[model samples]
Target: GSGERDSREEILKAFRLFDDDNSGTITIKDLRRVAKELGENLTEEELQEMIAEADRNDDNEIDEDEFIRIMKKTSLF
Candidate 1:
C-alpha cells in the first residue's frame, strides 16, 4: 500500500540518520540526535522506551539490523 511504502521510506530516513557513524548502526547518542531532529522531543522516559524497543542487541544501543527489524515490526513500514 502507498501508506506502507511511504512509512517505510520515512522510517528508513530516520534510521539512516541514526546510523551516525556510517557503520549502519546507532548509539544511544545517535538516537538522541535523530529524535531531536524529528522533533520527537523525547524525554528520558520516552527516549528510553523507544530505545528499549529497538535495542534487541542487548548492547544498550540500536544497531542497523536491530533498527530495521524493529521498524519492520511497525508493519506500517
Candidate 2:
C-alpha cells in the first residue's frame, strides 16, 4: 500500500507536468520530452512503434489508466 501510494503519487506529479491545463493526458510529445530527459533516448521511430503497439484504437494519448496499461507490459520487468 505504501509503495503503491508513493509510486503513483510521484507519477501524478511527473505526468502532471505535461498538463498545461489543470489535467492532461500523456501525448507523443510527452513521451518524447520525458524520454529524452530520462536519457533512455529511445529512437523517434522506436517510441512511435512502441506507442502504436500499445493499442489498436485511436491511442493518440495516454491517460493514467492507459499509461498503466502500457506500463504494465513495458515494465513487465
Candidate 3:
C-alpha cells in the first residue's frame, strides 16, 4: 500500500521549491504563498506562530533544519 511515505524528503523538496532566493530558508511570504496554493488561508498571527514554532534559531524564518523538525513533528501533510 506504500503506507508511510517518505515525508522527510517530500517536505524538503517542497521547501526547496519555495525557497526562491536559495537562502536555505523560507519567509512568511513564502509560507503564505504555499498556504494559498494549498487552498488554505492563514492569518498573519497564525503564520507568525507557525514560524515561531519551527524557528529554532529565533531568526524569524524556517531553515532546512527547522523545516525538517516541524514537518516531522507536525505531519504537515
Candidate 4:
C-alpha cells in the first residue's frame, strides 16, 4: 500500500501537468501535445489508442480517477 500511495502521488503530478486546462480531464489533444512537449512522438492512432485504453467512461477524455486507475492497472506510474 505504501508503494501504491507513492505511485499515486507521483502519477497525480503527471496528470496535473498533462491536463492543460486544469479541467480535471485530459483530452486526446492534451495527450498529444504533452507527448510532443516531452519529445515523444506519437501517431494520431497511437494517441487515440492510448485514450481509448484509459477511457473507462467512453467519453473520450481521461479524468483524474481514470488516470489513476489506468496507471495502477498498467503499472505505468
lDDT of 4 by residue, 1-77 (tens): 59766877888998988998677899988898899999988898999999999998888889989999999898887
Ranking by TM-score: 4, 3, 1, 2
**TM-score of candidate 4 versus the correct structure, residues matched by position:** 0.82
- CA lDDT, candidate 3, residue 28: 83
**Candidate models: Cα lDDT each:** 0.73, 0.64, 0.82, 0.88
Winner on lDDT (3 vs 4): 4
What TM-score would every model get versus the actual structure?
0.64, 0.57, 0.73, 0.82
State the lDDT at 53 in candidate 4: 90
C-alpha positional error of residue 30 in candidate 2 after TM-score superposition, expressed in Å: 1.1
- Candidate 3 least-lDDT 10 residues: 1-10
At residue 74, candidate 4 shows an lDDT of 88
TM-score of 2: 0.57
**33-72: candidate 2 lDDT, tens digit per residue:** 7777778777768778766766445766667766556656
Clash counts for the predictions, in order: 0, 0, 0, 0
Q: In model 1, where do residues sit more than 4 Å from their true spots?
A: 1-14, 21-23
Candidate 2 error regions (>4 Å) = 1-7, 17-23, 55-59, 74-77
Better of 2 and 3 by TM-score: 3
